Write a protein that binds this ligand. Structure first.
Ligand SMILES: [Mg+2]
Length: 212
DNA sequence: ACCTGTGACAAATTGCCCTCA
DNA sequence: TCTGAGGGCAATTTGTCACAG
DNA sequence: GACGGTAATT
DNA sequence: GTAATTACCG
């Protein structure tokens, strides 16, 4: 049974923009940190490859490009911004990377919490769908069901959706339908929704879900 | 003015392949 | 030989906007 | 490369 | 021969 990720709701609801590969590495960082500290973490190529069913080559490529793409990225807890890394990554040994996560982020990871096993998300491809599945997990019940109403503006400002998704039909076509379909096809969750409106504008989305 | 969907195009990401220390 | 660090790819998804309703 | 089984040194 | 201990190939 796969590693059980837990995280403060403050991270689930933080504002940031990360890719799938970056979020994948971040889950392992959160696991290492939580089992305790100083903030220095490590990643092995071959273990990453085995965890996510990748080749060693493509694992290496994903880690390397994720790592150089962290530079300049920031995290916002609502309203305080932090950088993820305070030193570049570096490799002491072949197939091994050592990273220095901002230790000031530690209390935000481990505190009103969200939890899910890593097997639930490791087949999701779209990072916004990972964000949505995390935000739904935050409200999940022991038995595996839940219901929550999310505001559209808060979704856009938390997941940092691109500007053209401020037009609602593109929001529907390229974000909502795709990420719900991904969740329904790639996780053990079964998800439905309905739109809440005020005048002509749609203001919230109401999600209901159960477990298979 | 506002709202909805679709058709097109561009830009980015995916799982691939090959090569060599 | 097994790893992994590079160099590429075509097919697919994601981001953007004109247009008709 | 790095490692590890193999042959080849002394 | 054995048994300790180094260079090379896949
Ligand atoms: Mg990859």
């Amino acid at each position: 049974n796969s590693p059980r990720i837990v995280q403060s709701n403050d991270l689930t609801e933080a504002a940031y923009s990360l890719s799938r590969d970056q979020k994948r590495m971040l889950y392992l960082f959160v696991d290492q940190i939580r089992k305790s500290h100083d903030g220095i973490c490590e990643i092995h190529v071959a273990k990453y490859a085995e965890i996510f069913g990748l080749t060693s080559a493509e694992a290496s490529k994903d880690i390397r490009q994720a790592l150089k793409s962290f530079a300049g990225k920031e995290v916002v807890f609502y309203y305080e911004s932090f950088p993820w890394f305070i030193k570049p990554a570096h490799s002491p040994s072949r197939g091994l990377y050592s990273v220095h996560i901002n230790p000031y982020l530690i209390p935000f990871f481990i505190g009103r919490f969200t939890q899910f096993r890593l097997s639930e998300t490791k087949e999701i491809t779209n990072p916004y769908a990972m964000r949505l599945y995390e935000s739904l997990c935050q409200y999940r019940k022991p038995d595996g069901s839940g219901i929550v109403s999310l505001k559209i503006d808060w979704i856009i400002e938390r997941y940092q959706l691109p500007q053209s998704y401020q037009r609602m039909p593109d929001f529907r076509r390229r974000f909502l339908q795709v990420c719900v379909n991904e969740i329904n096809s790639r996780t053990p969750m079964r998800l439905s929704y309905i739109e809440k409106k005020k005048g002509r504008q749609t203001t919230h989305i109401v999600f209901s879900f159960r477990d298979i």
